[PDB]
Subunit: 252 residues, 4 copies
């Protein structure tokens, strides 16, 4: 029907939820993708459907790289067409994030599949599927990282995956421009800190941020996604907007 | 009375005009700075005042580097406070743009004063005067250039000024973040081309743009300015948003 | 006495010029190869005629798989076996071909080759090299000066070269404590793909500001030699373009 | 004969180590200086004692003004007068001090010194160099920290950003004349004379590769590479020589 539709990956919680909520408030129908967070995904879709019925569905998939990842990414895009008859927007938000020291219970090949698959390869396959299933304001927004050039110690694979995501953003903006598909990124600095992190460590990171000495709210991240998908960004493609309160400008 | 106020330099025509219009449509009172274009600046102020009385004034100043530039820039900022009692937004838009070949009727020192004054020095002095004078959403937007790393041939002084403006955007974002003043840029690729440029040459440039094979409208550039000054960008500082249709991604 | 270097993809073209120039500088070299056995041995024979027992070959497929970590460990081990030390790693081997987003290897094979060979193998080699460690230890990654203005329909290739920039910076930071420097060399057009038409080749040569020609392989190798030398002992996390200005040229 | 190089601000510290190392490589040198007349003439004496007639000094103020173009023309002229050629220009001279946005020198003077020395004088020297024209090249001393700048150094940071633009624009424009243009970007090298030793140590401790500043010689080594025949295909490149400092997050 006549409301546009969006896919948001890793949308059960945290930033991906804030993006799906804000898209839904702007008038989109949404596919809430999730991996393990089944209860949180269904609860969000229920909340959205209560606000406007038949406007949210969930879709489960592991985005770890394997020989079936192309099928799973094809299926995520397929689920948006099955529910809503169209797919206007793809938000690549799902991400694995953990250290992989170079000088050192997962195997290294599992670490590569997870950190490179979720951060880079699944975005590429979803982009291919999104583009191939096209028949309006079509675009993709990749969630990138403002600190990719000043990386955390011992996170090489995660950093490699986020750099690859910058290259995807640029390559796909170039190649999909003739189809009228825009491809942009939003690059948080510190936003919602990891659930595992102690308050004392959270505050150490907060104190580094020039603009307010605090992390970004999930909603502040979502605001920049909403801008890039909007008609106010219709000439914008291949741009990555930092939303980092100045953190990347701060020297050691 | 409770409306915020903005200074836009070089606002009589083209991009600066569209930025002043869009700020006014959003509810800002505006200072329309101009250098030579008196009749166009006053025409715009009159059109805006017809929409809402006493919401637009003009301010004449040459932004060429000289001994008097600091006083001129102080006076532009002062004009905003005298008209409207506050100054919430500064837009550094005014720009000289012409070739300065390295190998061979203005002298080179005049080219330096104009190209480095308008593009860099005047922004710095206006940023100083804006900050010295300071519900609040204070910010500065500098009009940058998406092609600064792939410059037009024989434009070294222009390119130097626009790189210096990147540095200003970054340095002032860091330094003004404790005052709650955000500093950002918008970087066009090809937007409004010269009226007197032959269509055949205009088309050579338009054909290079992946997204639509056309230049950006002034309004499309103004849209990204409006985003950055808005409450939707309240964690964004030190960022430069390209608005270039993918132009900067295209190899030779 | 003499230091030792591993050069991946060293049988031909750029990696060959790198191995030769390292050898000429006094390194012992491990010439890695995948399919190019005859050429790898040919170069080792040429080097060993110059100084005996200074060049060995090492076969390995650098495609991503469950066995890549073991293959990468073996490349590094081969250097230690032959020469008792490994001072320099040059990650030069690379797959290069288009992978259009909008439509034969399967996609997941193109991922294994383009991301495995250009990024994951460099990462695992870097891990094996650091694990096995006065001296001047460093790693040099063969990057691409055109990574921000990529060729149309080369997304996987571009992703892998961007990942290789991130590896260069992450490993430079993490290995600095061990005195291991990590840097890159980023060619523009050098030796054009054998596949490529002559007409397409001249089209590209014409774009290059500095002399309207491609880099020779030895011009690339010159920047590698600089980065491994004692004249670069404070340089880590740097990527030196060697592109004749190509990446400065607008559309 | 031997090639000739101009090194601006060559009396002391990094510019001095660059002049020494070019001279050791074979070059005749113009040692440009502003205030450091004793140190300039003393280096030139040292170099000439090694090889007679291979070093001269040239005094000039690189502050921006309507006579800066004549002064930069004079610097290039002095190389031609002494040596009959000018193969290499090193833009090393630089003013460096804070210019806070929120409040001895007027702001017009701070702009003229920080933008003139770091950017305008390089541009004018590049113009004069190119206009008077084997292995010709220019090397600009940039700054590895330009995107993670010191607090309250906007004018300095603006100048160094402009110098990056100059390096790119001049590389593009001079390539058809066979002139290469590149940069060397130190992180922390010889720390300011004015700085206390506790602040010097805070900076040293930030550097991943060795927890120490670059020697002036290590900066000069990269300059030597870029002017050498081993960098003949290199133009528009800026080499960081920063021990990883620019990689370290806040
Ligand atoms: N939070 C920050 O400060 C910050 C900073 C920089 C960049 N970012 C970027 O912003 C985005 C969102 O940040 P965030 O903190 O909201 O992310 P997050 O909570 O770390 O992860 C978001 C979701 O990713 C999904 N995910 C993880 N591994 C997966 C797999 N193998 N298959 C499928 N899905 C998987 C998970 O879904 P389930 O829970 O359903 O398993 C998870 O809820 C990410 O791209 C991130 O890298 C965030
Ligand atoms: N148009 C494009 O494609 C494009 C591309 C990249 C970047 N940009 C940037 O976007 C901004 C707006 O572009 P535009 O094409 O609208 O600019 P423009 O028409 O070239 O110039 C804007 C105004 O700048 C003012 N200006 C010029 N020299 C001045 C001086 N010495 N003192 C004071 N004001 C002076 C002039 O005002 P008066 O007319 O009143 O004298 C002029 O109308 C500029 O910063 C530009 O560099 C534009
Ligand atoms: N040529 C250029 O203009 C250019 C431009 C930009 C960047 N570069 C970078 O420069 C480096 C060298 O360039 P080049 O033109 O010399 O490279 P190339 O000829 O395309 O490839 C070099 C060698 O890489 C090895 N290789 C490819 N796939 C492999 C796999 N799955 N397993 C193991 N080895 C494999 C091959 O070795 P075998 O032959 O033994 O099978 C090949 O001979 C590359 O990293 C490249 O991306 C080159
Ligand atoms: N040292 C570092 O850590 C570091 C870090 C990043 C970048 N850099 C860059 O590397 C280069 C060399 O560094 P450095 O520490 O050796 O420089 P420095 O000691 O601060 O300055 C070099 C020389 O510049 C000259 N100079 C200053 N103002 C001048 C003017 N108005 N006219 C003419 N000359 C003037 C002075 O010459 P006289 O003494 O003859 O007056 C001075 O000796 C500079 O471009 C610098 O910005 C250095
Ligand atoms: N998928 C995700 N990507 C990222 C990227 C960055 C951050 C973030 O919070 N970074 C600050 C941070 C800094 C250091 C450490 Cl050790 C940790 Cl665990 C977290 C958190 C996340 S969650
Ligand atoms: N103050 C101004 N700054 C700029 C910056 C860039 C452009 C612009 O037109 N860029 C594309 C372009 C189009 C045509 C020609 Cl001939 C050239 Cl040199 C450049 C136009 C302007 S007007
Ligand atoms: N392993 C390798 N990596 C690279 C990277 C770039 C090039 C190169 O020649 N690029 C220019 C170019 C690349 C692709 C095409 Cl289709 C055309 Cl026509 C021209 C060649 C190679 S070989
Ligand atoms: N002409 C010159 N340019 C530069 C650029 C940077 C440095 C340097 O010392 N940077 C480190 C540093 C710079 C400024 C301060 Cl306030 C402190 Cl504490 C530490 C020193 C110089 S001297």
């Amino acid at each position: 029907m006549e409301a546009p539709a969006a896919v948001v990956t890793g949308a059960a919680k945290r930033i991906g939820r804030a993006i799906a909520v804000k898209l839904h408030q702007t008038g989109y129908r949404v596919v809430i993708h999730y991996h393990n967070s089944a209860e949180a995904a269904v609860s969000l879709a229920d909340e959205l459907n209560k606000e406007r019925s038949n406007t949210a569905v969930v879709c489960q998939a592991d985005l770890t790289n394997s020989n079936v990842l192309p099928a799973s990414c094809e299926e995520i895009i397929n689920s948006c067409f099955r529910a809503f008859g169209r797919c206007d927007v793809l938000v690549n938000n799902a991400s694995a994030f953990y250290p992989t020291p170079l000088v050192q219970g997962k195997t290294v090949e599992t670490q590569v599949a997870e950190l490179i698959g979720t951060n880079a390869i699944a975005p590429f396959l979803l982009t291919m599927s999104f583009a191939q299933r096209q028949k309006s304001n079509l675009s993709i927004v990749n969630l990138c990282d403002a600190m990719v050039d000043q990386p955390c110690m011992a996170f090489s694979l995660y950093n490699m995956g986020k750099h690859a995501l910058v290259g995807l953003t640029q390559s796909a903006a170039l190649e999909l421009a003739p189809y009228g598909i825009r491809v942009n990124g939003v690059a948080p600095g510190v936003s919602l800190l990891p659930v595992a992190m102690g308050e004392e460590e959270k505050d150490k990171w907060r104190r580094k941020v020039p603009l307010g000495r605090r992390e970004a709210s999930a909603e502040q991240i979502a605001d920049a996604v909403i801008f890039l998908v909007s008609g106010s960004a219709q000439y914008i493609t291949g741009s990555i907007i930092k939303v980092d309160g100045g953190l990347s400008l701060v020297h050691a």
